[PDB]
Every structure is written in C-alpha cells, then in structure tokens.
Amino acid sequence: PRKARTAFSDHQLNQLERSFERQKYLSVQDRMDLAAALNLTDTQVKTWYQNRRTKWKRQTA
DNA sequence: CGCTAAATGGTT
DNA sequence: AACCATTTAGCG
C-alpha cells in the first residue's frame, strides 16, 4: 500500500518555490493556508518543503 | 538515469 | 508533531 506520486501543476511548483524563497520553514497555520491556496493536502506541502530543504543543502554544499 | 515525491527509521 | 538523513520508487 503506497500513495500515488502527486504530479504538481506548473502553478503549484511556482507557488511552492515562491513560498520557499520567502521562508525556509512554515508554521502549521502557514502550511495549512498554502495547501488550501494550492488545493494540496497539508502532508503534500509538508513533504514538498522537507524534500526542498534536502535539495537546498546539496546545492549549497 | 536524474530529479523529486513518498517511505523508513531515527532524533528533537 | 515535525524535522532530519537516507532510501525507495514513479515518471519524463
């Protein structure tokens, strides 16, 4: 039992990256606001942010 | 294969 | 509950 891989829209990727350039971390309230704005789940936004921080560390190494 | 979403197991 | 480090795995 596995979740289908979300395919993010161009609009969703654009707004997640904008969120990340403004704030490396999100409060619970900012995370839930972002998910609602993008029509994603809280956990999909929490996962994108986590994986984005992993990417951020590798490309600043 | 590379990028990156989701899962695993640990940390805090 | 959320994050971290790493692994697993889907898709272009």
Author numbering: 232 to 292
The authors write:
However, the energetic contributions of particular dinucleotides can deviate strongly from the additive approximation, indicating that some TFs can specifically recognize DNA dinucleotides. Here we solved high-resolution (<1 Å) structures of MYF5 and BARHL2 bound to DNAs containing sets of dinucleotides that have different affinities to the proteins.
There is only one water molecule connecting the side-chain oxygen of Thr285 with the side-chain oxygen of Asn282 and one water molecule connecting Asn282 with N6 of A7 of AC. In addition, the side chain of Arg289 has only one conformation, rotated away from the protein–DNA interface.
